[PDB]
Amino acid sequence: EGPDNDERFTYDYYRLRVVGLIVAAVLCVIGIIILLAGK
Amino acid sequence: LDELKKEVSMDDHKLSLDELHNKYGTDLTRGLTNARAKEILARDGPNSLTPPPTTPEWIKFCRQLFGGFSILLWIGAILCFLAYGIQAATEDEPANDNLYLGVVLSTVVIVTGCFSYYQEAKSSRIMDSFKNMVPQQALVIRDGEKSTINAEFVVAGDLVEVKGGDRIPADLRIISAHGCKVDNSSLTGESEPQTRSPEFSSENPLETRNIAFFSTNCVEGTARGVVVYTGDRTVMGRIATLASGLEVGRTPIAIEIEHFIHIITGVAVFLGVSFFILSLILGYSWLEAVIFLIGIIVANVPEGLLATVTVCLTLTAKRMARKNCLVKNLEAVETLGSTSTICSDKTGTLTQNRMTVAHMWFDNQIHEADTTENQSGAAFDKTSATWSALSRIAALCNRAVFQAGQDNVPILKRSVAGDASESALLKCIELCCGSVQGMRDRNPKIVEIPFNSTNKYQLSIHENEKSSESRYLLVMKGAPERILDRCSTILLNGAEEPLKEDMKEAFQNAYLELGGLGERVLGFCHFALPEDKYNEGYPFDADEPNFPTTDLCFVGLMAMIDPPRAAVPDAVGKCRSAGIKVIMVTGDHPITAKAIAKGVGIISEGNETIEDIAARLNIPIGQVNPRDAKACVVHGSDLKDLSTEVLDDILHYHTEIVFARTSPQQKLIIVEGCQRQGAIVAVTGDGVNDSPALKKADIGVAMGISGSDVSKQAADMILLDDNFASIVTGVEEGRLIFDNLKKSIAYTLTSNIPEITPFLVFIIGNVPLPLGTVTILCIDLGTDMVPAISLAYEQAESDIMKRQPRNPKTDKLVNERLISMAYGQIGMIQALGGFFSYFVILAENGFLPMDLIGKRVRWDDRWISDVEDSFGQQWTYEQRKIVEFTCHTSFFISIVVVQWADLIICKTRRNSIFQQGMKNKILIFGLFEETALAAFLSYCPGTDVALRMYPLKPSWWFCAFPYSLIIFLYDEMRRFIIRRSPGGWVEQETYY
Amino acid sequence: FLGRTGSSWFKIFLFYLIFYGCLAGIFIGTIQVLLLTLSDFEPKYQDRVAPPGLSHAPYAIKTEISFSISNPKSYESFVKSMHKLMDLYNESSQAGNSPFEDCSDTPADYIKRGDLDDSQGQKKACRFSRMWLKNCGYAEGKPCVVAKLNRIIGFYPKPLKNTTDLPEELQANYNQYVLPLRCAAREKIGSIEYFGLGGYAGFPLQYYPYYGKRLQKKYLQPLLAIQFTNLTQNMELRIECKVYGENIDYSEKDRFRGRFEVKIEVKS
Ligand SMILES: *[C@@H]1O[C@H](CO)[C@@H](O[C@@H]2O[C@H](CO)[C@@H](O)[C@H](O)[C@H]2NC(C)=O)[C@H](O)[C@H]1NC(C)=O
Ligand SMILES: CC(C)CCC[C@@H](C)[C@H]1CC[C@H]2[C@@H]3CC=C4C[C@@H](O)CC[C@]4(C)[C@H]3CC[C@]12C
Numbered sequence A: 001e002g003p004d005n006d007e008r009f010t011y012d013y014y015r016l017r018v019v020g021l022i023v024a025a026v027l028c029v030i031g032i033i034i035l036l037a038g039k
Numbered sequence B: 001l002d003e004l005k006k007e008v009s010m011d012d013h014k015l016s017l018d019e020l021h022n023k024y025g026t027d028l029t030r031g032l033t034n035a036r037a038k039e040i041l042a043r044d045g046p047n048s049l050t051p052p053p054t055t056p057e058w059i060k061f062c063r064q065l066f067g068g069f070s071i072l073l074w075i076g077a078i079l080c081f082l083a084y085g086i087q088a089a090t091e092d093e094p095a096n097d098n099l100y101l102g103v104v105l106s107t108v109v110i111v112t113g114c115f116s117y118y119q120e121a122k123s124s125r126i127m128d129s130f131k132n133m134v135p136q137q138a139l140v141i142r143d144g145e146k147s148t149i150n151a152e153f154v155v156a157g158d159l160v161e162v163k164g165g166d167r168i169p170a171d172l173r174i175i176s177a178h179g180c181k182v183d184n185s186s187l188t189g190e191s192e193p194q195t196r197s198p199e200f201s202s203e204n205p206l207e208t209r210n211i212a213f214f215s216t217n218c219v220e221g222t223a224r225g226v227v228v229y230t231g232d233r234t235v236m237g238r239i240a241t242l243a244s245g246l247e248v249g250r251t252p253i254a255i256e257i258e259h260f261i262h263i264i265t266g267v268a269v270f271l272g273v274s275f276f277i278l279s280l281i282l283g284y285s286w287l288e289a290v291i292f293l294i295g296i297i298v299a300n301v302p303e304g305l306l307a308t309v310t311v312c313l314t315l316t317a318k319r320m321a322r323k324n325c326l327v328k329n330l331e332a333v334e335t336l337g338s339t340s341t342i343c344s345d346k347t348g349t350l351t352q353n354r355m356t357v358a359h360m361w362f363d364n365q366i367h368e369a370d371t372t373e374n375q376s377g378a379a380f381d382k383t384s385a386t387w388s389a390l391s392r393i394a395a396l397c398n399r400a401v402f403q404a405g406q407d408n409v410p411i412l413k414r415s416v417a418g419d420a421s422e423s424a425l426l427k428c429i430e431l432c433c434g435s436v437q438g439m440r441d442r443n444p445k446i447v448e449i450p451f452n453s454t455n456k457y458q459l460s461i462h463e464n465e466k467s468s469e470s471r472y473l474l475v476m477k478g479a480p481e482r483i484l485d486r487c488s489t490i491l492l493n494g495a496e497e498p499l500k501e502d503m504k505e506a507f508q509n510a511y512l513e514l515g516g517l518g519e520r521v522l523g524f525c526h527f528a529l530p531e532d533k534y535n536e537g538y539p540f541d542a543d544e545p546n547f548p549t550t551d552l553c554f555v556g557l558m559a560m561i562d563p564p565r566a567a568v569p570d571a572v573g574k575c576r577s578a579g580i581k582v583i584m585v586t587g588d589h590p591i592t593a594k595a596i597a598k599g600v601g602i603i604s605e606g607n608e609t610i611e612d613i614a615a616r617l618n619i620p621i622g623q624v625n626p627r628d629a630k631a632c633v634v635h636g637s638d639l640k641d642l643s644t645e646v647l648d649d650i651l652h653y654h655t656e657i658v659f660a661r662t663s664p665q666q667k668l669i670i671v672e673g674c675q676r677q678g679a680i681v682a683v684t685g686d687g688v689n690d691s692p693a694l695k696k697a698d699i700g701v702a703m704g705i706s707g708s709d710v711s712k713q714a715a716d717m718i719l720l721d722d723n724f725a726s727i728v729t730g731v732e733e734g735r736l737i738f739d740n741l742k743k744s745i746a747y748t749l750t751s752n753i754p755e756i757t758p759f760l761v762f763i764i765g766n767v768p769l770p771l772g773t774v775t776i777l778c779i780d781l782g783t784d785m786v787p788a789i790s791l792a793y794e795q796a797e798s799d800i801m802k803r804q805p806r807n808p809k810t811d812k813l814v815n816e817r818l819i820s821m822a823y824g825q826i827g828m829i830q831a832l833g834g835f836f837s838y839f840v841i842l843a844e845n846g847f848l849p850m851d852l853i854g855k856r857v858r859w860d861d862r863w864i865s866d867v868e869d870s871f872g873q874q875w876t877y878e879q880r881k882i883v884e885f886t887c888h889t890s891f892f893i894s895i896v897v898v899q900w901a902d903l904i905i906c907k908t909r910r911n912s913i914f915q916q917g918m919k920n921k922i923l924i925f926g927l928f929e930e931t932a933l934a935a936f937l938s939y940c941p942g943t944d945v946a947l948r949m950y951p952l953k954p955s956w957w958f959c960a961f962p963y964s965l966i967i968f969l970y971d972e973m974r975r976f977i978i979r980r981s982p983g984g985w986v987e988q989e990t991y992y
Numbered sequence C: 001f002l003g004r005t006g007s008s009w010f011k012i013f014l015f016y017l018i019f020y021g022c023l024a025g026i027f028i029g030t031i032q033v034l035l036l037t038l039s040d041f042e043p044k045y046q047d048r049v050a051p052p053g054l055s056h057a058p059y060a061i062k063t064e065i066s067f068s069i070s071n072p073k074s075y076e077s078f079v080k081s082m083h084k085l086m087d088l089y090n091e092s093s094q095a096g097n098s099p100f101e102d103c104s105d106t107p108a109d110y111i112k113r114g115d116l117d118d119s120q121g122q123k124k125a126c127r128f129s130r131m132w133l134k135n136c137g138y139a140e141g142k143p144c145v146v147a148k149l150n151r152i153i154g155f156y157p158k159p160l161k162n163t164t165d166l167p168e169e170l171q172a173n174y175n176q177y178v179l180p181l182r183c184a185a186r187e188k189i190g191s192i193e194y195f196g197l198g199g200y201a202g203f204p205l206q207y208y209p210y211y212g213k214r215l216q217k218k219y220l221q222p223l224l225a226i227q228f229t230n231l232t233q234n235m236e237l238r239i240e241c242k243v244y245g246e247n248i249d250y251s252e253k254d255r256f257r258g259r260f261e262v263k264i265e266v267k268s
């Protein structure tokens, strides 16, 4: 917007962290699954 | 020091009984005086063995703390505390950087110390096992009276008494004996009881009957003797010292490790000081000049590599534990793969160590029995009525019995009370005719004449199990020729017939052939006594010939031997196909040694000794060109008068070598001879007479079930199930781990470049620091760890058992070709991918690449809270630093992303991924966990403080993707060239 | 030689020359495409400069400006940087209707010169006289520090509204058009005096938004002179200058995030 362009200097680092941690966890689980296919 | 002990012993068995007493101030009848014995005790010292001085574990741990990488990491750790000290004095720095980084680095050294300490293990209790062979007490005659004393109180000169069941307390001169037999397997590896008597019977004291040795035991009878040697001075006490004293030495794998440590340490100190001066010339304060150096150290040293190696070794040892192959020393996991020569004991190693029936001669025909443990062969005969007649004599004319409670275990494995030949016959009949006890119940023995030294035969009279007869049957066995002189008829295919010169000659032929096979041959015959001349109550006199022992019916011959283990012939061939030379080294007699050599394939068909040529051509052995003989059989008595140079010529000039009737020191000498030629040697054995050889071997392998305690103490590896096929597996595993270590090392080293280059450009370009010191440790200690380990699970790219053993002088674990690829090619591509993401982060935040050159001065200036970017905006100190640390984070993640491709390319040295596939589940696990770790380290809240890791925007993750892909393509194209032309260019330049 | 023969030494050179040449050519290619995705007038991200920093002219050794009044070369270090900044706000530097403009001598509202486009020439910036900075060689005794708000493209600094309570409660509250700056230390052993545009202790909103170096060169950002004529002497005084606003925030880590950290000591 014009004088109300506050969103330009903002970033949702909170969501990014939530998503990043979700991904890291799921990649960790996936890895266990493939490894445990025989121990 | 031990050169004296490598020599054959000298003795006094040639002296008379009386003469021997003068030498030791002793009485043949009264024995020593209580006072004289105590005097000699203080004089000579105790009848005991002293363990050699060991190196304390303290010094062993700390010796690892100073090996190249640890030295550089120490210099870094201290240089951290240096810069910290210089700070705490000058400008009060409330930070924790240099202090904490110095603590972290010192911990890395200590923990890395534990890993190398675990790898360099030496579990040795040789002298302890020997000490277990000295009895607690001994029986001596002192002041004309026998008393039990502490065996350590035994001295040279006293009168000792032994009987069946006790250990020989010391080396004795036999002066009196009654039916005494002894088990000399300690000195020979052969357990057949040897008679002991006062009479001298051989110039060689290790063969004479009037000497009994410490480390052996009396098996039966009784004997008295004069002690000639005590403690360390006994024949086997010296073997003990020799074995326990032998310098261990460095393994092939250990030598390789130190070698690349020098290389990497070299480039580290090079670039280290090369840029330390390069910085001072650029006008950098010593305050900074050291900070850069610390970074250089951390970049160059692969912090997690030595521990990777250890884990890869451990994991390989775990797989072998699961095939009944125990590894005592982690490094011995690889030595077997580098082995070019195997020196093998015969008895209990190549062989089962059990007299077993091998052949039978009946119906004018040679039949072969199955000698294998698990009986993997086939039948020979069942139909012939002759067989049942021979079978009956083998069961009936036999005094051997199975021990109680064995019905659970297989026939051939069960313990038997009796001599070896009777046990063999027992197990033979029990196997192919069912319960022998049944045959001995159906035919009650009424009278017998046990085998006599003079008679050379054993006879028995039984009540024929037949109801229509119920009469008296005579059976006998003995020396083949003696049995022949007592026969008139031969049971041919059922019906008897006169013994014509024809069948008599066929007997001699059969007899000579079986004997030529190194087999012990016995004759078997029976005689159905006439009914009218022998009533149902007729008494037979065993003392005086009350019955005919002539004109009997010859039934057949039976031959026997201590046979090879089932898997042994095939394992020997497999070792030989892998280009490993196999030598036999045995305490056993030459005829037996040679026969098993041919049986297992040590001596291949057609190959001759000089003696074979001479007999065939009917010419003198001196007339034979010795170069025409590729095979040789060396008796220990001849070995004794040969110099090592002459032993070296024997080793060089023959492909098929048998060393027979060797002493324990002689086995050591043969091993050393092989090593002297530059060969990596394995020893396989099971007896205490293998202990020195096992110790000296680059790798000693002991048998687990049949092995003596001493042998297993001297070994690096134990075959817990006695499965000789495990050697073949071991060499295969050893070769595979050697290749996979290269892959894992290249992988680990490759990521050093993207950690080095940022620090260099930081100096030469004056740009903001692309990657931090902490960030490097997150790679080498964090992300790269599981992937690097996973390479240990790689399958072979080709048939590794088809290639020759590596040349330890030329074929190195880390060579110039590895460095060229890891440092010069792939690592260089990784460095760029790192920098790219760095320029991306900065440029998208307002600092375009052009304006970055020569800005670090203002960038690092803590007091300038208004640096102008390319767009004209002003940044505080902490604001721009957040972007900088975000650059460290994405550079870090870029390494991870480019290591994805590197992990896949390091999978194979030659083959394509499209050929080898992706069947390594640990590797895939590594990829997922590596990425999970990196994401966690970036997105987890609080990690921006502890590690200076900042959250990355989604687009950031993809910066290095095009570089990750170029790596995959590049290496795939390169290896395509290797395969397409075995010529050499790409091969001799980059082929690891 | 060391490794190989001359023929081999050559081939290994011909390879790495072509190899590294290609790699350099590829690296450059990826840099090209990166630049191609970026604007010339505005950076892709601005969340890392977001809350504006407040920086001053006196180059602090360590957020500190200690000196002796009874000594000449004791403050000549801080006068060097003070001069460096103010030397830019010269009238001879601001000449003609291009590219400067005379703007309200009193704090006014924002000025939009269109978009971040080159569809116009150099966007005309408001003039600023260093003569608006009353009282301030500089203050040889009791320094005359000069404040500054960090430039951010398209940033509209918004003052706080007088809805509730305020630190400098309602005094000279030019609510609509001034971004205030109140310095503080309890520990009240000083004498705060502020100088600026229109005589206000803030930043005139008529200098915003900043259009960037590419679209606005020679642009001048508003200054706020602060004088501490403290009646005290020979002691470290921790003085913090804070700016207030809707788009202004602070951090415990970044001690320059919309605030000062000055340790004055007139040890004379
Ligand atoms: C910006 O203004 C300052 C004001 O002090 C100028 O400093 C002048 O320097 C000259 C020569 O050194 C002196 O004779 C004057 O006394 C100073 N003041 C004035 C008001 O003229 C400085 O030169 C100016 N800078 C530029 C680039 O124009
Ligand atoms: C950051 C940049 C400027 C550094 C570049 C370093 C280059 C020149 C280095 C890195 C790795 C190096 C190579 C690594 C391996 C080998 C194989 C060896 O048998 C001869 C030297 C040779 C061929 C090296 C020559 C120089 C080399 C290519």
Ligand SMILES: *[C@@H]1O[C@H](CO)[C@@H](O)[C@H](O)[C@H]1NC(C)=O
Residues within 6 Å of the ligand: C134, C135, C229
């Ligand atoms: C600042 O200077 C003016 C003259 O320009 C003078 O009248 C005034 O006293 C000075 N103020 C202070 C607080 O010293």
Ligand SMILES: [K+]
Residues within 6 Å of the ligand: B298, B299, B300, B301, B302, B303, B752, B755, B776, B780
């Ligand atoms: K490293």
Ligand SMILES: [K+]
Residues within 6 Å of the ligand: B694, B695, B696, B697, B698, B699, B700, B714, B715, B716
């Ligand atoms: K050994």
Ligand SMILES: [K+]
Residues within 6 Å of the ligand: B302, B303, B748, B749, B750, B751, B752, B780, B784
């Ligand atoms: K590394």
Ligand SMILES: [Mg+2]
Residues within 6 Å of the ligand: B189, B345, B346, B347, B348, B349, B685, B686, B687
């Ligand atoms: Mg043996």
